[PDB]
Amino acid sequence: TEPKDYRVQPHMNVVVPEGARVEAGDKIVAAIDPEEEVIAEAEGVVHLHEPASILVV
Amino acid sequence: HEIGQVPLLTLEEEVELARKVEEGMEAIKKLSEITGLDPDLIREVVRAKILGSARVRHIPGLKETLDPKTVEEIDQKLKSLPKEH
């Protein structure tokens, strides 16, 4: 396994569950417009590791 | 003072909240495209749940509007869609 951290922009949004399955022909984080920012290269798991805030309910 | 109860939004929260609505507005069409029901109507029957715990007006516009047993049947058709719609 090989780690690699992508930086999610303010004007962006993720479409991945709490560490779920990720394919090679998939898009993880949606952007303002499709920039060469987030396209999946290889199989693995995306881990959320810095929310800007936390909601407790 | 009621007004001070609600707090300001982030340059990210503002954005993120807005993105839900535009899609919701599209979704509303997308539904009316499939159901064959009207955008103006779906938008009511959807609001008549998110707000309509009681919000379903006391008298339905003196029967201009319909708020009785009718609401569910619509949201019952919307619940009874195949998963992708």
Swiss-Prot record, chain A:
Disulfide bond entries: none
UniProt record similarity statement: Belongs to the RNA polymerase beta' chain family.
Task of the protein: DNA-dependent RNA polymerase catalyzes the transcription of DNA into RNA using the four ribonucleoside triphosphates as substrates.
Subunit structure: The RNAP catalytic core consists of 2 alpha, 1 beta, 1 beta' and 1 omega subunit. When a sigma factor is associated with the core the holoenzyme is formed, which can initiate transcription.
Protein name: DNA-directed RNA polymerase subunit beta'
Species, as recorded: Thermus thermophilus (strain ATCC 27634 / DSM 579 / HB8)
Lineage, broadest ranks: Bacteria, Thermotogati, Deinococcota, Deinococci, Thermales
Residues of the full protein shown: 340 to 396 of 1524
From Swiss-Prot, chain B:
Functional description taken from the UniProt entry: Sigma factors are initiation factors that promote the attachment of RNA polymerase to specific initiation sites and are then released. This sigma factor is the primary sigma factor during exponential growth.
UniProt keyword annotations, A-Z: Cytoplasm, DNA-binding, Sigma factor, Transcription, Transcription regulation
Name of the protein described by the UniProt record: RNA polymerase sigma factor SigA
Record bears the keyword Transcription regulation: yes
Disulfide bonds listed in the record: none
Residues of the full protein shown: 86 to 170 of 423
Subcellular location: Cytoplasm
A Gene Ontology biological process term: DNA-templated transcription initiation
Subunit and interaction comment: Interacts transiently with the RNA polymerase catalytic core formed by RpoA, RpoB, RpoC and RpoZ (2 alpha, 1 beta, 1 beta' and 1 omega subunit) to form the RNA polymerase holoenzyme that can initiate transcription.
Domain comment in the entry: Contains 4 domains, connected by flexible linkers. In the active conformation, the domains are in an extended conformation, each making extensive interactions with the RNA polymerase catalytic core.
Region Sigma-70 factor domain-1: start-end pairs: 1-28
Signal sequence segment: none
Entry's family note: Belongs to the sigma-70 factor family. RpoD/SigA subfamily.
Primary location class: cytoplasm
GO cellular component entries: cytoplasm
Single GO term (MF): sigma factor activity
Residue intervals passing through the bilayer: none
